[model samples]
Target: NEQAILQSAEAWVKKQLMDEDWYHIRRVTLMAKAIGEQEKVDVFVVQIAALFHDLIDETAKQQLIDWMEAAGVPSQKIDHTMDIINTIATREAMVVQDADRLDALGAIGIARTFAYSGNKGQPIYDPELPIRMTVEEYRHGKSTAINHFYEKLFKLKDLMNTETGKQLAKERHVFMEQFIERFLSEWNG
Candidate 1:
């Protein structure tokens, strides 16, 4: 019951994110529905995972963990919550992950990544640091927004668990790859 209540509250919070959140939900839901494998996970757990996926992303990972502890959710449960949210392969979870990844790829991902960099006062790219860094290193690195691709976005396809998600990623991933290729080509020329 409490989880249900949290689910409702999270939904309300999502509504506040406007079109980004809405389109994500719509697109992922449709994609997930097409792939029947994703429905095996429990609905309540899916609700928790999907709603909270972006609660603390790259931007506020630490703060979200702190807030979870403050809310009396023990570290173990919190970790388990993350496990379900992160690893559970379901149609819903796939959709949620797709939405999150979609936000990180394509034209939208590029704009949002740059906007995020601006907000955090990070640079666009740093030649000395190089864009390709390990997740741990990047977590602590001061690299620019474009460097994020070298660090994370490029690895998303392999990280994706479901077939539906993998299929969808091909086009989006290629788009970014082309974008990067053209960018470098123009830069060199």
Candidate 2:
């Protein structure tokens, strides 16, 4: 059953992912499920993709596929899940993609930005650092917490894929924009 498979996947991911990552995955899973409903896509694929998407950061793709197989998740489901994971661009994958990016947008986005910078020993804000960043620079370069808003999070608003995802992202995107403006004004004072 779908519930059995999802339960097993959740347990597996919760063991591997940590505090912020765990919550992020949980939110994205729900978000994907909602978006999937609107898109009329496969619920199983999107949910599994959201749960294990961050698993790629902690382990190999094959290990995830293998784990699913061992759990008796069925070959068809495993293949669809991996295609979504591998960026194969099925409608189900699009829903998951939108869900993933949407998580990086609102109030949660601002909080995670600060947490990540602090965890990496980076400053909260730096006057010397310019906001503009290349893909390489953005991925692995010196950056402050505030700069992350410009570097990636702000851009996700336009990048949202599904219609439902885009609409949901709109409000969250505005919140972040307002938050950034508020921060910049206060910083100068």
Candidate 3:
């Protein structure tokens, strides 16, 4: 089943994800597997879910379902897969979810913020602009890279679903805090 699904999705995953995103996906997969092992979750499910979690947007949920069905994933397992693909629904799903979020913290998170900002032509910070209070506010404003740290990354730690995730988040979270502090100090200089 895992082989079937992995083979089926290989072409599409390679086509859709850029090098950086692909690297990120692999990291998430490894992270999910490690967490799943620690938490006694289904590693099979965690690996599959982690691999495809960000392969498509929410609008393409059916695409994943169709691919899974075509891959010979059992109908029941497809449901479990879809639960992770669409939203968190199982311990394995939660493990993948936590792993995904963990990628948005610490040094990697900081690098991603600037990379995303560069893509969008946004500045790294804007002292005159206040931090976004909500997703809607962030979406509507020309928020800086620094605002992204507050709007999303900083909140990921408490939102972790597994003990392993929470523990990992604590370390990454502290690293991010320290990075942000030094970032501000350098910004002021």
Q: Show model 2 residue runs off by greater than 4 Å.
A: 16-20, 58-74, 126-130, 135-142
Q: Which ten residues in a row have the lowest lDDT in candidate 3?
A: 132-141
Error at 176, model 2, angstroms:
0.9
For 56-88, candidate 2 gives per-residue lDDT tens digits of: 642588888887888677788788897888673
For model 3 the local lDDT of residue 13 reads 76
Per-residue lDDT of model 1, residues 1-189, tens digit only? 445555554555467576455555544433444432354544443444555565443445455455556556656655655564546333555555664565467787777778888998987766677544366674776767767777778778777756666776777789888887887787677
Which one wins on TM-score? 2
lDDT of 3 by residue, 15-81 (tens): 7775545888788888998998999877777877888887765448877888777777788887887
Whole-model lDDT, model 1? 0.60
> How far does residue 104 in candidate 1 sit from its true spot (Å)?
1.9
Query: How close to the true structure is residue 135 of candidate 2, measured as C-alpha lDDT?
Result: 67
Worst 10 residues of 2 by lDDT: 15-24
Give the Cα-based TM-score of candidate 2 against the true structure: 0.80
Q: Can you tell me which runs of candidate 1 are displaced by over 4 Å?
A: 1-95, 132-140
Record all residue pairs in model 1 with backbone atoms less than 3 Å apart, i.e. clashing.
Answer: 38-90, 38-91
Query: Which candidate tops lDDT?
Result: 2
